[PDB]
């Protein structure tokens, strides 16, 4: 497990293998900090990690994304290279 820390103070603990989904994180890699990415975005990023790993080797379901978080989420994905 590794700890990903969001802009607004939240702490997310996810399995290291899953976080490596991010090029940026894989490269930086016990604890990581993201002064620019807020919790409501970073939680979705982690879910995408779970989703990516679980379905990365076999029918795949829709990954829901509310329009209201999409722009910030795109920036996060861009920075995180995932």
């Amino acid at each position: 497990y590794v700890k990903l820390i969001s802009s607004d103070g939240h702490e997310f603990i996810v399995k290291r293998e899953h976080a490596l989904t991010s090029g940026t994180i894989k490269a930086m890699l016990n604890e990581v900090n993201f002064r620019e990415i807020p919790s409501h975005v970073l939680s979705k990023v982690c879910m995408y990690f779970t989703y990516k790993v679980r379905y990365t080797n076999s029918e795949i379901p829709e990954f829901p994304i509310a329009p209201e978080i999409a722009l910030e989420l795109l920036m996060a994905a861009n920075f995180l290279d995932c």
């Binding site: 603990i13 409501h40 939680s43 879910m47 779970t50 829901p64």
Partner: protein, 70 residues
Amino acid sequence: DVFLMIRRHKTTIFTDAKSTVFELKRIVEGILKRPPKDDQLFTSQTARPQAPATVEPFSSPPELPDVMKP
């Protein structure tokens, strides 16, 4: 296989499991060195990788830009 979000104060653990409530308390112990749902004291339909079930609020997303409204 079932995918949880175990939440408390400003921390959040993301983790999967099969299996009783008892043995999940042990996994937490594994992470946050403490010893052993909704307003109370979890399925493939109900808790998916992309939509973990939850076991402090997150930030409030900003206003949808005007050009993206219907």
